[PDB]
């Protein structure tokens, strides 16, 4: 299934839409601070964002900002974050 859920993407779409999305995209400028609020170092956000940046253009759309939301919340009370975008968390629009 999708590493993310419907109830988790729901809170992700509130954080993504809390920065003001553009045509369906958030710029690292809105996510960076969103990831810096998790009390995590830039090493987790540098990895939570990359595996979250499906387009890798310095932005995180609703679907990209979602992959980086659990990657941030699960990095605090779950486990560490690797740098390998898992196939159970990637949208079929990137392939």
């Amino acid at each position: 299934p999708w590493a993310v859920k419907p109830e988790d993407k729901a809170k992700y779409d509130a954080i993504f839409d809390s920065l003001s999305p553009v045509n369906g995209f958030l710029s690292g400028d809105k996510v960076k601070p969103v990831l810096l609020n998790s009390k995590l170092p830039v090493d987790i956000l540098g990895r939570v964002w990359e595996l979250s940046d499906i387009d890798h253009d310095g932005m995180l759309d609703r679907d990209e900002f979602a992959v980086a939301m659990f990657l941030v919340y699960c990095a605090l009370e779950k486990e560490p974050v690797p740098m390998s975008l898992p196939p159970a968390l990637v949208p079929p629009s990137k392939r």
């Binding site: 690292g28 400028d29 996510v31 956000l45 964002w49 990359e50 940046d53 310095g58």
Partner: peptide, 6 residues
């Protein structure tokens, strides 16, 4: 230009 933490 793509990661705000790199």
């Amino acid at each position: 230009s793509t990661n705000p933490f790199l």
